[PDB]
Design a protein around this ligand. Structure first.
Ligand SMILES: N=C(N)NC(=N)NCc1ccc(S(N)(=O)=O)cc1
Ligand SMILES: N=C(N)NC(=N)NCc1ccc(S(N)(=O)=O)cc1
Ligand SMILES: [Zn+2]
Length: 257
């Protein structure tokens, strides 16, 4: 029964998930002047040419575009990572207003939304095992700002009417997640956590510096989704973001000068 409401939102999560007050929680504010360039961060490798999307699901928190992760079809390697991380799903966090919605912030700036491409370390065999490990997941985070449309997002936008309410799914094959990437792969990285319960401290975060732009109409369609199930009181799926958490004993590294 966690969520994003007044009575069950981020300030309440610690009562069921005490790791919410842990040593490596996410998201964080990225202080760009304090991040340090790490010249040894070896090139990042996004290999999504053989990606196989399967389905899109409204899980009551967000919507997930799910991939076949039973082979190395869409993988992330390089950068801070040791080994191979398979893409399992992507989702977004977004606001009720264009001035909020991202989970990470950059010098305290919120973006309108944030895309999370979730990958698990193949050495752990399955996603469920990976989330129990400190290096189990790699999440590629991409900021969204409102401006020009993102053509490669439109197929996602257009299916949302079919998954309005919690528990709905729709087949979603042949979607190419390369159409959601910015031009540059410059990034910041730090060790953190899942940003929703169970808040497990299993993530290497890789947050791209360059935001993608989406149109006002595209984000407006995100905001028509519902947190509730069909036949329950309508509650718009907006402001499904956790605010920045204390950095504690962490350094954020930059791939770029
Ligand atoms: C209503 N608050 N009912 C129950 C409820 C369930 C879980 C949580 S949480 N946020 O700690 O997981 C809060 C409240
Ligand atoms: N551990 C689970 N709940 N299992 C699962 N299927 N996904 C959980 C999950 C995956 C990614 C993120 S995020 N926002 O940090 O990218 C939060 C939660
Ligand atoms: Zn997320």
């Amino acid at each position: 029964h966690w969520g994003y409401g007044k009575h069950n939102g981020p300030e309440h999560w610690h009562k069921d998930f005490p790791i919410a007050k842990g040593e490596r929680q996410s998201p964080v504010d990225i202080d760009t002047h304090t991040a340090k360039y790490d010249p040894s961060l070896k090139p990042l490798s996004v290999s999504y040419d053989q990606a196989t999307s399967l389905r899109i699901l409204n899980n009551g928190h967000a919507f997930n575009v799910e991939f076949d992760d039973s082979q190395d079809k869409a993988v992330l390697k390089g950068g801070p990572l040791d080994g191979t991380y398979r893409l399992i799903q992507f989702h977004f966090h977004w606001g009720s207003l264009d001035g909020q919605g991202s989970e990470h912030t950059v010098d305290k700036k919120k973006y309108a939304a944030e895309l999370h491409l979730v990958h698990w370390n193949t050495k752990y065999g399955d996603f469920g095992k990976a989330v129990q490990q400190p290096d189990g997941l790699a999440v590629l985070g991409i900021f969204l700002k409102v401006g020009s449309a993102k053509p490669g997002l439109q197929k996602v936008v257009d299916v949302l009417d079919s998954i309005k309410t919690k528990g709905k799914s729709a087949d979603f094959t042949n979607f190419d997640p390369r159409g959601l990437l910015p031009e540059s792969l410059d990034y910041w990285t730090y060790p953190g956590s899942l940003t929703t319960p169970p808040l497990l401290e299993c993530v290497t975060w890789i947050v791209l510096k360059e935001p993608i732009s989406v149109s006002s109409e595209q984000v407006l369609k995100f905001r028509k989704l519902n947190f509730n199930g069909e036949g329950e009181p309508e509650e718009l799926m907006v402001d499904n973001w956790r605010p920045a958490q204390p950095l504690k004993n962490r350094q954020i590294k930059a791939s770029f000068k």
